Amino acid sequence: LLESGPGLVKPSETLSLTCTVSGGSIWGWIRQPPGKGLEWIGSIYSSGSTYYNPSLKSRVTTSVDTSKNQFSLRLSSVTAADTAVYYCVAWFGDLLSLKGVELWGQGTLVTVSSASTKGPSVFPLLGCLVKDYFPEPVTVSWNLTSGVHTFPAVLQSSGLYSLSSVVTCNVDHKPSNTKVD
């Protein structure tokens, strides 16, 4: 499924995300804080029946509109505690000849922070140095796929990330809407 919405949300504000889906009978949201396990947020059934994680239930809004191929999540009054990769999930089950179909979004990292979004500066290494950006993530393509190694970001003392990619590099930093060749 295709997932979208800001990767940066301020403390006390509202996280909003959408997934496009065509059909299904159960729709839900699952999250995973960095280095942690999966945590169910909520589900909506085709009947409209709706269930939320009790530790979150005051802050969660989920909605489905199947005619507009969408389902959505809002999470109000966020804190650093809500920093996580968020996944939307759609159950189809036994459809045609296919069995147990459950589609997952690719996962969207949402960082709860009052710090500003900051685009990267790109420097030549061969490779490309992607430095001093915030928040994660940065993605890198070349033009070339073989022999490409993009490393995990360092978090520097500045509170900003930097990473390196080794083999024209195409750096994408969606949170700041920055694409560097």
């Binding site: 839900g28 459950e102 430095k131 490393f151 360092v154 520097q156 003392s157 390196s164 080794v166």
Partner: protein, 200 residues
């Protein structure tokens, strides 16, 4: 609510079993579901209804449920199976979907591998030391200015080929970089140190 052992391991070609422990309100009365999650990837459904495979899941994966416990079995193990595995089930008493804490599966029998080390100078100041393809996943990193020992070094992490990577960074001012004959990234792995050097 659902307990899994934090880690499991197996040997290529062989088998592993991963357990999931719950209660009568979840596993005892409800279907169990299993997920595979490769690092930085979406979880993938392996098993539904306790013991059924979705289309496109290898029959190397199988599930069973024994009272208030469930188990995922993986046969014909491969290095690519190295991942986190999660059980899940509905809980009648919380009216909630609950997940196990997850089990990290390590695949054994990897030979030891010296790190590939690449030191970049600052382009025409930050020094970038890239350490790749090492096993096991521990590295000691040390920097030299000329001969004498702003360092930020990433925790090691698993690559896709199940070997390990790390990067070390050295921030300098342009004047600091110019006033030395060389700078060095020294990488120690299993008591074996390789030095890389760059020169202003």
């Amino acid at each position: 609510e659902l307990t899994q052992p934090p880690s499991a391991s197996g040997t290529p070609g062989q088998r592993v079993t991963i357990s999931c422990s719950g209660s009568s309100s979840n596993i005892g009365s409800n279907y169990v579901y299993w997920y595979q999650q490769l690092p930085g990837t979406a979880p993938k459904l392996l098993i539904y209804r306790n013991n059924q495979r979705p289309s496109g899941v290898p029959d190397r994966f199988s599930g069973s449920k024994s009272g208030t416990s469930a188990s995922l079995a993986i046969s014909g193990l491969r290095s690519e199976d190295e991942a986190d595995y999660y059980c899940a089930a509905w809980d009648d008493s919380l009216s909630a979907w609950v997940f196990g804490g997850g089990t990290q599966l390590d695949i054994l029998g990897q030979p030891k591998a010296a790190p590939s080390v690449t030191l970049f100078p600052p382009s025409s100041a930050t020094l970038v030391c890239l350490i790749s393809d090492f096993y096991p996943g521990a590295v000691t990193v040390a920097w030299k200015a000329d001969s004498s020992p702003g360092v930020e070094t990433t925790t090691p992490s698993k690559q896709s080929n199940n070997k390990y990577a790390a990067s070390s960074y050295l921030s300098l001012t342009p004047e600091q970089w110019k006033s030395h004959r060389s700078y060095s990234c020294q990488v120690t792995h299993e008591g074996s140190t390789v030095e890389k050097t760059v020169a202003p």
